[PDB]
């Protein structure tokens, strides 16, 4: 059997965060935001925000062509203000801590798509599409369900080209 891509992608992530030192910034214990919902809900810190970008860039831009590249100006992936989802919107959302982690990276799982970095699963929940950019609520959830449990990122804005042009790891 050949290995498939999705394979080394999940790995190669993998390393990046390590590189990155992602792991100690994604944990409890760095997990030092204001309270948003008592008692369990808290806002990520700025490193929090600003490693999950630079890894949704590292893993978007890896793969985008290079004939669209030279003819399309690519924005910055950012969070934007507002769409803060609710404590049962959160709670309900859970669901992808049930996911096998091989279901990474992978944008067919629709409103459960999701990456794992440290001790957080973090889900990019679908908000809406407008103009030319993918918005989306990213939560993340403690793997072990200790304190901080659940962690308030933002609301991320992608250029929707970029997630088009990776398709679908699975059905």
Known sequence: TDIPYH????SDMERVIEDNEMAHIFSASSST??????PSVFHATEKQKNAAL????????????????????IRDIEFVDGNIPSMLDIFTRRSVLKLLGYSAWDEGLGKQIFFDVGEYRVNMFPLRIEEGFHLRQMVAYH???ANPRYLWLGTVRIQSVLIENIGYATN
Not at 7 to 10: R, V, Y
């Open 33 to 38: 935001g204001e309270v948003l919902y008592s």
């Open 143 to 145: 793997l072990q369900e």
């Open 54 to 73: 630079s890894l949704l860039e590292e893993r978007y831009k890896r793969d985008f062509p290079h004939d669209l590249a030279e003819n399309i100006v």
């Open 7 to 10: 394979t080394e992608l999940l």
